[PDB]
Amino acid sequence: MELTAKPRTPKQKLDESMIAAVAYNKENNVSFALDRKAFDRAFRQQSTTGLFDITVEGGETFPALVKAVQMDKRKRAPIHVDFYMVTYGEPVEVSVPVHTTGRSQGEVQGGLVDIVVHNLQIVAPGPRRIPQELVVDVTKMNIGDHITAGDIKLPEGCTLAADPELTVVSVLPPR
Amino acid sequence: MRRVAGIVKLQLPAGKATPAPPVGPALGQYGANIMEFTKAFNAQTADKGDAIIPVEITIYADRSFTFITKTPPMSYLIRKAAGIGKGSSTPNKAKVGKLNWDQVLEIAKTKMPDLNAGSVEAAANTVAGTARSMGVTVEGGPNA
Amino acid sequence: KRTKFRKQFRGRMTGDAKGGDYVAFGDYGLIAMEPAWIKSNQIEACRIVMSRHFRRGGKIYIRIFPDKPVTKKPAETRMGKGKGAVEYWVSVVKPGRVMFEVAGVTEEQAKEAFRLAGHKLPIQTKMVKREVYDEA
RNA sequence: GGAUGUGUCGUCGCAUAGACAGCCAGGAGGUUGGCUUAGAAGCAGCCACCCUUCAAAGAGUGCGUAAUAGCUCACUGGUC
């Protein structure tokens, strides 16, 4: 990733296709603007646990995870991004999409693989070794079994900000 | 009446004497003889007895016929190998039975010029693969 | 459809759609383009439409809901003597606001069941897929 | 609501390992899969898509038959 500008007036961009911007280090905070193209590319590549570098048109590469996106609700494209410049050892409370793995035995008797929480608010691995996704085997589930946040796995050195009993991906009946 | 040949694949019950729905004028409308098939097909069902043995018939002209009687798709002596006479409604919500691997040696030794495979493992795994739509689970697999 | 008890009556105004312009509950989602009104039957329509298409049975999320009492006076009177009795009910769907979310079917089923859905409505429409991630 | 009208930007895929299309040949054996049915055997409706081999070939997609059979494609190879 790479920007060029950082004023308050946006005619330097917009039509020329760049996105309104902020990125804070937490002692260092900076407004700016970053070309749409690349941002969309990488942000679907890497998303909300992505981490990527900021080589401002000055020469000062930076470490950036993506924090908040804010978009044109009508035209349905993005117009603004909040960043979080990562630190070192301790990070933040990563948001990570629950997936589903394997041909489940729950879908063979009329049931359906329903993710009652599309995304998971964990806590801290360290801001350089982050889970992008998650993998919750579903095979063992029949029809009527849910999966609480206890049963959810871990990669080691991480904690679950979510209540260990509320429902993530549960099989639903037919019809 | 005429001479216009025909290659007819069909299917007929074993030891009976077909009514109106099956044959009748289903292969005799090109030109063949019925008198020596009611008494010439129902006599080799004294060989293999009680299963839908398939039939193929090739027709020349005048009153000519040349048939071949193959191997009964034991969806008769396997439906019995369980508990239901009329097959499972849905093979994945209601089942039939569970045959042994040694009752896969009568479909892989009657079908010598049919299951066009070379090995025994293949010629077993074929109709054992059929043994899934019938609604049946296999007493087999690796190890065991 | 209709509600349970309430206030009774109304009025009207517009300017863009609050929330929630995001794809929760489902993988695929259909989104309005015009500052419509929408009626009990206008949505029960798409309920029964998509619910035809998906068979048994999908998973169908009607993200909109009629709460607005719209009236019509008795036909043939000169105005005055009242406000009209409550004719029907309306969901005040504004643009970018998302009306339908479904999943538990594939991409083709979303395209088509949403096509047939949107051929029942006073609005041009766009269907899409997730990524609106401010809060799942 | 529909349109290979015609210009502009952008996504996605495919092939110097032979492409989209033109013509050439298979488009297969279990298996009328089971359910259902007066019969449905690819094809009127209900749960499932497993194998034999292969240069390749999927209980397959349409026209069809009351049901057959029969005609084309999904892939495969020669050509260009």
XYZ file of C-alpha atoms (C1' of nucleotides) in Angstrom:
535
model
C 0.000 0.000 0.000
C 1.101 3.639 -0.457
C -0.440 7.113 -0.179
C 0.615 10.599 -1.297
C -1.486 13.278 0.371
C -2.865 14.270 3.753
C -4.700 17.648 3.733
C -8.341 18.448 4.544
C -9.373 19.264 0.940
C -10.058 16.173 -1.217
C -9.943 17.503 -4.834
C -6.433 15.967 -5.115
C -8.208 12.617 -5.403
C -11.808 11.359 -5.426
C -12.418 11.471 -9.187
C -8.788 10.429 -9.588
C -9.912 7.501 -7.406
C -8.385 7.543 -3.907
C -9.891 6.885 -0.454
C -10.142 9.288 2.509
C -7.812 8.249 5.315
C -6.613 7.939 8.917
C -4.027 5.692 10.596
C -2.945 5.959 14.215
C 0.159 4.497 15.894
C -1.376 5.676 19.235
C 1.302 8.308 19.907
C 1.527 8.992 16.187
C -1.802 9.670 14.362
C -2.011 10.737 10.730
C -4.767 11.655 8.240
C -4.105 10.926 4.530
C -5.452 9.419 1.294
C -4.875 6.093 -0.514
C -5.763 5.103 -4.140
C -8.930 2.953 -4.298
C -7.651 0.157 -6.600
C -4.865 -1.182 -4.408
C -6.897 -0.801 -1.190
C -9.773 -2.881 -2.525
C -7.399 -5.493 -3.920
C -5.454 -6.014 -0.716
C -8.446 -5.514 1.586
C -10.293 -8.412 0.070
C -6.987 -10.289 -0.106
C -6.156 -9.532 3.530
C -9.219 -7.945 5.257
C -9.658 -7.129 8.978
C -6.659 -9.161 10.196
C -4.558 -8.443 7.140
C -1.586 -6.328 8.246
C 0.133 -4.319 5.517
C 2.783 -1.675 4.899
C 2.524 2.127 4.491
C 5.321 3.638 2.379
C 4.073 7.273 2.351
C 5.253 9.383 -0.600
C 8.114 10.595 1.603
C 9.955 7.394 2.535
C 8.831 5.970 5.879
C 7.382 2.433 5.698
C 4.834 1.568 8.412
C 2.985 -1.529 9.806
C -0.810 -1.483 9.285
C -3.689 -3.746 10.166
C -7.082 -2.571 8.869
C -9.457 -1.329 11.582
C -12.681 0.259 10.316
C -14.126 0.732 6.815
C -16.819 3.291 6.034
C -18.540 3.241 2.635
C -21.048 4.941 0.331
C -24.214 3.160 1.448
C -25.921 3.942 -1.880
C -23.221 3.512 -4.540
C -21.974 0.694 -2.228
C -18.273 1.471 -2.511
C -15.891 2.592 0.249
C -15.087 6.257 0.925
C -13.059 6.113 4.175
C -10.712 3.930 6.255
C -9.660 3.906 9.921
C -6.355 2.112 10.517
C -4.450 0.799 13.538
C -0.653 0.978 13.238
C 0.486 -2.174 15.009
C 3.104 -2.104 17.804
C 5.208 -5.089 18.670
C 4.249 -7.807 21.119
C 0.801 -7.064 22.473
C -1.932 -6.258 19.919
C -5.717 -5.842 20.079
C -8.959 -7.778 19.888
C -8.865 -9.077 16.290
C -12.142 -9.784 14.452
C -12.016 -13.123 12.611
C -14.511 -14.939 10.369
C -15.710 -18.376 11.483
C -15.678 -20.823 8.593
C -16.878 -24.416 8.234
C -14.912 -27.536 7.277
C -15.712 -30.908 5.758
C -18.842 -32.500 4.345
C -20.832 -32.398 7.595
C -23.106 -35.247 8.612
C -25.587 -32.524 9.601
C -26.582 -31.835 5.987
C -27.328 -35.479 5.100
C -30.587 -35.725 7.084
C -32.189 -32.495 5.861
C -30.303 -29.971 7.983
C -28.309 -26.833 7.203
C -24.842 -25.397 8.047
C -25.839 -22.055 9.600
C -23.184 -19.692 11.068
C -25.149 -17.941 13.881
C -22.074 -15.685 14.176
C -20.353 -14.852 10.878
C -17.464 -13.161 12.776
C -15.573 -13.633 16.051
C -14.153 -11.033 18.432
C -11.157 -12.756 20.072
C -8.169 -11.328 21.935
C -4.466 -10.904 21.132
C -2.099 -13.399 19.524
C 0.597 -10.786 18.970
C 0.424 -8.341 16.040
C 2.419 -10.373 13.456
C 1.106 -13.925 13.915
C -2.684 -13.451 13.570
C -5.357 -15.991 12.595
C -6.973 -14.852 9.330
C -9.868 -17.317 9.638
C -10.920 -20.220 11.849
C -11.762 -23.902 11.271
C -14.684 -25.458 13.129
C -15.257 -29.090 12.085
C -18.970 -29.610 11.875
C -19.105 -33.302 10.935
C -19.924 -34.540 14.445
C -23.035 -32.350 14.498
C -26.349 -33.898 13.545
C -29.608 -31.919 13.661
C -30.218 -29.934 16.852
C -26.610 -29.631 18.050
C -25.107 -26.113 18.342
C -21.462 -25.135 18.903
C -20.735 -22.871 21.893
C -17.661 -20.599 22.119
C -16.026 -23.191 24.360
C -15.929 -25.834 21.613
C -14.288 -23.235 19.368
C -10.602 -24.011 18.864
C -7.415 -21.962 19.344
C -3.960 -21.664 17.716
C -2.029 -21.026 21.070
C -1.262 -17.707 22.812
C -4.776 -16.375 22.144
C -7.883 -15.756 24.286
C -11.615 -15.598 23.447
C -13.307 -12.290 24.338
C -16.607 -14.027 23.653
C -18.809 -15.824 26.185
C -17.852 -19.556 25.970
C -21.495 -20.703 25.741
C -23.233 -18.472 23.153
C -24.062 -20.021 19.801
C -21.727 -20.038 16.803
C -22.482 -22.152 13.680
C -25.468 -24.416 14.444
C -27.343 -26.831 12.184
C -30.955 -25.933 11.423
C -33.893 -28.261 10.625
C -35.302 -28.643 7.071
C -38.169 -26.442 5.709
C -43.673 -58.541 -44.925
C -40.455 -56.572 -45.431
C -36.680 -56.475 -44.963
C -35.586 -53.495 -42.828
C -33.298 -54.642 -39.980
C -33.242 -53.509 -36.350
C -31.078 -53.386 -33.202
C -33.421 -53.561 -30.192
C -32.371 -53.362 -26.527
C -35.210 -54.325 -24.188
C -35.915 -55.950 -20.828
C -38.177 -58.885 -19.918
C -39.321 -60.894 -16.851
C -37.821 -64.373 -16.440
C -40.140 -67.354 -16.075
C -43.533 -66.071 -17.210
C -45.206 -65.242 -20.540
C -45.387 -61.434 -21.024
C -48.778 -59.620 -21.200
C -49.586 -56.401 -23.091
C -47.426 -53.730 -21.367
C -44.015 -55.309 -22.187
C -43.653 -56.902 -25.641
C -46.578 -57.941 -27.833
C -45.874 -55.576 -30.747
C -42.742 -54.048 -29.114
C -40.253 -55.888 -31.353
C -42.626 -57.904 -33.526
C -43.591 -54.777 -35.457
C -40.390 -54.961 -37.508
C -40.718 -58.683 -38.250
C -40.114 -61.687 -35.985
C -41.625 -64.858 -34.457
C -43.332 -65.009 -31.032
C -44.249 -68.726 -30.879
C -40.608 -69.751 -30.323
C -39.785 -67.167 -27.645
C -42.715 -67.927 -25.336
C -41.399 -71.523 -25.414
C -37.717 -70.657 -25.987
C -37.108 -67.954 -23.385
C -39.264 -69.398 -20.597
C -37.214 -72.616 -20.745
C -33.827 -71.070 -19.939
C -35.459 -69.463 -16.912
C -35.305 -73.031 -15.690
C -31.566 -72.308 -15.582
C -31.257 -69.137 -13.492
C -34.554 -68.877 -11.615
C -36.325 -65.747 -10.243
C -34.642 -62.391 -11.118
C -35.025 -59.770 -13.890
C -32.499 -61.214 -16.350
C -31.967 -58.646 -19.154
C -32.704 -59.509 -22.805
C -31.353 -58.080 -26.068
C -32.923 -58.820 -29.442
C -31.610 -58.253 -32.976
C -34.096 -58.510 -35.865
C -33.308 -59.293 -39.521
C -36.413 -59.766 -41.693
C -39.269 -62.125 -42.656
C -39.711 -64.152 -39.452
C -36.147 -64.017 -38.056
C -34.934 -63.486 -34.474
C -31.605 -63.777 -32.643
C -31.660 -63.019 -28.895
C -29.182 -62.942 -25.995
C -30.114 -63.550 -22.337
C -27.606 -61.916 -19.963
C -27.126 -61.807 -16.189
C -29.828 -60.937 -13.604
C -29.034 -57.662 -11.735
C -29.394 -59.252 -8.282
C -31.589 -56.402 -7.066
C -33.804 -59.386 -6.231
C -31.533 -61.732 -4.243
C -30.151 -58.720 -2.320
C -33.416 -56.945 -1.515
C -34.125 -60.271 0.191
C -30.688 -60.048 1.845
C -32.075 -57.527 4.331
C -35.771 -57.356 5.145
C -37.638 -55.352 2.491
C -39.269 -56.637 -0.686
C -39.837 -53.225 -2.271
C -36.693 -51.060 -2.117
C -35.846 -48.134 0.160
C -37.740 -44.858 -0.408
C -34.673 -42.653 0.077
C -31.230 -44.349 0.443
C -30.095 -41.513 2.774
C -33.085 -41.232 5.145
C -34.179 -44.889 5.262
C -32.010 -47.966 4.667
C -32.243 -51.610 3.634
C -29.544 -54.062 4.775
C -25.835 -54.903 4.775
C -24.429 -57.704 2.597
C -21.147 -59.531 3.219
C -18.252 -59.282 0.753
C -18.814 -62.973 -0.138
C -22.259 -62.113 -1.489
C -20.331 -59.854 -3.854
C -18.895 -63.005 -5.485
C -22.150 -63.963 -7.250
C -22.416 -60.626 -9.063
C -18.679 -60.766 -9.770
C -18.767 -64.338 -11.117
C -22.053 -64.309 -13.047
C -20.990 -61.071 -14.769
C -17.812 -62.293 -16.491
C -18.490 -60.645 -19.886
C -20.404 -57.655 -18.416
C -18.503 -55.770 -15.663
C -15.787 -54.910 -18.210
C -13.083 -54.730 -15.541
C -9.995 -56.908 -15.186
C -9.330 -57.271 -11.468
C -11.513 -58.855 -8.764
C -11.340 -55.795 -6.489
C -12.702 -53.672 -9.345
C -15.387 -56.203 -10.329
C -16.512 -56.273 -6.685
C -16.347 -52.511 -6.120
C -18.583 -51.975 -9.199
C -21.875 -53.515 -8.051
C -20.793 -52.764 -4.483
C -20.996 -49.206 -5.787
C -24.461 -50.119 -7.050
C -24.957 -51.316 -3.467
C -25.483 -47.716 -2.358
C -28.462 -46.586 -4.454
C -30.329 -49.732 -3.423
C -30.091 -48.069 -0.003
C -27.587 -50.474 1.532
C -24.417 -50.070 3.664
C -21.379 -52.309 3.049
C -19.926 -54.809 5.514
C -16.553 -53.893 4.033
C -13.813 -51.313 3.605
C -10.102 -51.382 4.447
C -8.841 -53.602 7.299
C -11.812 -55.416 8.934
C -46.958 -8.685 7.799
C -49.196 -6.567 10.099
C -48.321 -5.693 13.705
C -50.085 -6.207 17.078
C -51.134 -2.900 18.750
C -49.858 0.722 18.376
C -50.558 4.466 17.829
C -52.888 4.293 14.685
C -51.945 7.041 12.174
C -49.061 8.855 10.357
C -47.482 11.180 7.772
C -44.409 11.057 5.491
C -40.867 12.454 4.617
C -37.535 11.157 3.042
C -33.697 11.494 2.707
C -31.303 8.435 2.752
C -31.466 5.108 4.711
C -30.068 4.643 8.246
C -29.181 0.993 8.796
C -28.700 -1.730 8.300
C -26.916 -1.740 4.967
C -24.908 -4.905 5.867
C -24.976 -8.602 5.070
C -25.737 -10.383 8.385
C -27.649 -13.665 8.834
C -26.778 -14.715 5.285
C -24.129 -15.092 2.634
C -26.210 -13.356 -0.120
C -28.246 -10.162 0.068
C -30.660 -7.996 -1.949
C -30.646 -4.233 -1.612
C -33.172 -1.479 -2.595
C -32.305 1.536 -4.856
C -35.348 3.802 -4.493
C -37.024 5.614 -1.541
C -40.121 3.466 -1.673
C -42.911 2.527 0.691
C -43.535 -1.210 1.000
C -46.708 -3.137 1.942
C -47.631 -6.246 3.989
C -48.629 -8.090 0.857
C -45.811 -6.551 -1.152
C -43.379 -8.422 1.056
C -45.441 -11.547 1.800
C -45.272 -11.681 -1.981
C -41.497 -12.151 -2.006
C -41.782 -14.452 1.005
C -43.946 -16.827 -0.994
C -41.920 -16.237 -4.169
C -38.462 -17.034 -2.915
C -40.014 -19.746 -0.687
C -41.301 -21.287 -3.901
C -37.844 -21.190 -5.439
C -35.633 -22.554 -2.597
C -37.805 -25.687 -2.069
C -37.207 -27.200 1.424
C -36.467 -24.638 2.305
C -33.410 -22.391 2.462
C -32.901 -19.767 5.096
C -34.803 -16.549 4.419
C -34.358 -13.219 6.233
C -36.933 -10.494 5.663
C -34.890 -7.544 6.881
C -37.791 -5.148 6.358
C -41.027 -4.637 8.217
C -44.331 -2.693 7.782
C -45.065 -0.464 10.733
C -46.665 2.520 8.957
C -50.410 3.056 8.885
C -51.491 4.431 5.450
C -55.044 5.538 4.953
C -57.517 6.271 2.189
C -60.734 8.112 2.838
C -63.984 6.310 2.091
C -64.255 6.430 -1.707
C -66.531 9.204 -3.021
C -66.687 11.745 -0.156
C -65.555 15.367 -0.332
C -62.667 15.923 2.119
C -63.299 16.832 5.733
C -65.082 14.963 8.558
C -61.870 13.007 9.188
C -58.700 11.267 8.326
C -58.993 8.049 6.395
C -59.402 4.753 8.207
C -56.336 2.594 8.097
C -56.179 1.151 4.603
C -52.901 -0.708 4.772
C -49.376 -1.047 6.306
C -46.025 0.114 5.045
C -42.303 -0.385 5.499
C -40.596 2.855 4.585
C -37.524 1.258 2.884
C -34.921 3.940 1.863
C -31.971 3.343 -0.533
C -28.810 1.376 0.179
C -30.912 -0.191 2.954
C -31.004 -3.951 2.552
C -34.300 -5.781 2.421
C -33.483 -9.418 1.928
C -30.789 -11.719 3.168
C -30.665 -15.372 2.320
C -28.211 -18.204 2.431
C -28.466 -21.938 2.752
C -28.692 -21.939 -1.013
C -26.072 -21.241 -3.688
C -25.189 -18.236 -5.892
C -27.606 -19.220 -8.627
C -30.430 -19.563 -6.143
C -29.706 -16.124 -4.783
C -29.569 -14.530 -8.249
C -32.821 -16.136 -9.412
C -34.903 -16.149 -6.175
C -33.937 -12.492 -5.832
C -34.798 -11.814 -9.491
C -38.252 -13.220 -9.088
C -38.441 -11.330 -5.778
C -37.511 -7.995 -7.339
C -39.923 -8.381 -10.211
C -42.605 -7.897 -7.515
C -41.491 -4.465 -6.274
C -41.635 -0.679 -7.057
C -37.862 -0.452 -7.084
C -34.775 -1.184 -9.124
C -32.524 -3.429 -6.998
C -29.015 -4.812 -6.623
C -28.104 -8.218 -5.084
C -24.634 -8.823 -3.556
C -22.382 -10.662 -0.998
C -21.054 -9.749 2.527
C -17.846 -7.701 3.309
C -19.846 -4.897 4.985
C -17.877 -5.353 8.160
C -18.488 -2.638 10.736
C -20.289 -5.226 12.871
C -21.383 -8.781 11.995
C -39.443 -4.452 -18.021
C -36.370 -5.877 -22.300
C -31.512 -5.035 -26.197
C -24.324 -8.917 -29.083
C -26.973 -0.366 -30.463
C -22.663 2.579 -29.807
C -18.359 5.067 -27.229
C -15.441 5.110 -21.427
C -13.561 3.087 -17.229
C -13.078 -1.767 -14.139
C -13.637 -6.870 -12.528
C -13.114 -11.995 -13.911
C -11.450 -16.445 -17.243
C -9.154 -18.808 -21.110
C -5.347 -20.445 -24.171
C 2.750 -20.138 -27.799
C 1.112 -26.917 -22.947
C -3.064 -24.952 -29.088
C -7.638 -21.839 -27.207
C -14.066 -19.482 -27.771
C -16.198 -20.990 -32.580
C -15.895 -24.191 -38.017
C -16.171 -29.175 -39.449
C -14.302 -34.874 -37.335
C -15.267 -39.293 -33.709
C -16.846 -41.355 -28.629
C -20.539 -38.781 -25.692
C -19.533 -45.282 -22.622
C -21.006 -51.249 -18.734
C -23.030 -51.790 -14.381
C -28.094 -49.207 -14.343
C -35.208 -49.732 -16.084
C -30.134 -46.637 -9.612
C -33.748 -46.626 -5.758
C -38.303 -44.269 -4.608
C -42.860 -43.587 -7.625
C -45.977 -45.797 -11.532
C -51.149 -48.011 -15.797
C -45.667 -47.849 -17.611
C -40.932 -42.896 -16.111
C -35.784 -46.892 -18.183
C -31.146 -39.038 -18.510
C -35.692 -36.606 -18.495
C -44.120 -36.351 -14.607
C -43.050 -35.667 -8.932
C -39.436 -37.380 -3.744
C -33.665 -38.527 -1.046
C -29.091 -39.253 -3.506
C -24.955 -38.636 -7.381
C -21.359 -44.453 -6.545
C -18.155 -47.091 -9.843
C -15.615 -49.978 -14.818
C -12.185 -47.829 -17.722
C -9.970 -44.431 -20.233
C -7.217 -40.031 -25.881
C -12.002 -38.874 -23.182
C -17.521 -40.174 -21.179
C -21.275 -36.972 -15.397
C -27.961 -41.813 -11.958
C -26.096 -37.006 -17.361
C -29.473 -31.068 -21.067
C -32.845 -30.421 -24.418
C -36.587 -32.227 -28.863
C -38.968 -36.415 -28.024
C -42.081 -41.721 -26.427
C -48.306 -42.867 -22.976
C -43.143 -45.488 -21.587
C -39.023 -47.454 -25.232
C -35.692 -46.715 -28.357
C -33.858 -42.842 -30.751
C -31.202 -37.066 -32.133
C -27.416 -32.917 -29.651
C -24.306 -31.111 -26.145
C -20.679 -31.298 -20.271
C -15.454 -33.635 -21.406
C -12.061 -35.830 -25.009
C -8.498 -36.091 -29.747
C -7.290 -34.784 -34.869
C -7.469 -30.218 -37.334
C -6.773 -24.300 -37.728
